[PDB]
Short mmCIF file of all heavy atoms in Angstrom, two decimals:
data_model
loop_
_atom_site.label_atom_id
_atom_site.label_comp_id
_atom_site.label_asym_id
_atom_site.label_seq_id
_atom_site.Cartn_x
_atom_site.Cartn_y
_atom_site.Cartn_z
N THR B 1 47.03 -238.99 -6.95
CA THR B 1 47.10 -237.44 -6.53
C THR B 1 45.80 -236.75 -6.89
O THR B 1 45.01 -237.37 -7.67
CB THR B 1 48.27 -236.72 -7.29
OG1 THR B 1 48.19 -236.91 -8.65
CG2 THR B 1 49.59 -237.31 -6.77
N UNK B 2 45.66 -235.45 -6.54
CA UNK B 2 44.51 -234.64 -6.94
C UNK B 2 43.20 -235.28 -6.41
O UNK B 2 42.85 -235.23 -5.28
CB UNK B 2 44.75 -233.26 -6.42
N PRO B 3 42.44 -235.62 -7.48
CA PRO B 3 42.88 -235.82 -8.88
C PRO B 3 43.07 -234.49 -9.60
O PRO B 3 42.49 -233.43 -9.41
CB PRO B 3 41.81 -236.65 -9.51
CG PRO B 3 40.54 -236.41 -8.55
CD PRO B 3 41.03 -236.15 -7.16
N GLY B 4 43.93 -234.48 -10.64
CA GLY B 4 44.70 -235.71 -11.00
C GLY B 4 46.18 -235.52 -10.88
O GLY B 4 46.56 -234.57 -10.03
N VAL B 5 47.01 -236.33 -11.28
CA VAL B 5 48.56 -236.34 -10.99
C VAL B 5 48.70 -236.00 -9.56
O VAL B 5 49.47 -234.96 -9.23
CB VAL B 5 49.23 -235.35 -11.97
CG1 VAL B 5 48.87 -233.92 -11.66
CG2 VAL B 5 50.73 -235.57 -11.71
N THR B 7 43.22 -239.81 -5.74
CA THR B 7 43.08 -238.58 -4.84
C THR B 7 44.20 -238.38 -4.11
O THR B 7 45.25 -239.09 -4.03
CB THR B 7 41.91 -238.67 -3.84
OG1 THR B 7 42.29 -239.55 -2.89
CG2 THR B 7 40.59 -239.13 -4.58
N UNK B 8 44.30 -237.26 -3.24
CA UNK B 8 45.36 -236.89 -2.43
C UNK B 8 46.74 -236.79 -3.02
O UNK B 8 46.85 -236.08 -4.06
CB UNK B 8 44.91 -235.42 -1.75
N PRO B 9 47.78 -237.22 -2.45
CA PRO B 9 47.56 -238.55 -1.78
C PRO B 9 47.40 -238.56 -0.27
O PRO B 9 47.91 -237.75 0.33
CB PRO B 9 49.07 -239.20 -1.99
CG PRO B 9 49.91 -237.99 -2.19
CD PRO B 9 49.13 -236.88 -2.79
N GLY B 10 46.43 -239.40 0.25
CA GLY B 10 45.70 -240.42 -0.59
C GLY B 10 44.29 -240.12 -0.64
O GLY B 10 43.88 -238.95 -0.14
N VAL B 11 43.30 -241.00 -0.89
CA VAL B 11 41.96 -240.97 -0.86
C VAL B 11 41.52 -239.77 -1.83
O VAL B 11 40.45 -239.01 -1.44
CB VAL B 11 41.49 -240.65 0.59
CG1 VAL B 11 40.02 -240.82 0.75
CG2 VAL B 11 42.10 -241.68 1.41
#
Side-chain angles (χ1 to χ4, degrees):
Chain B
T1 53
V5 67
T7 72
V11 190

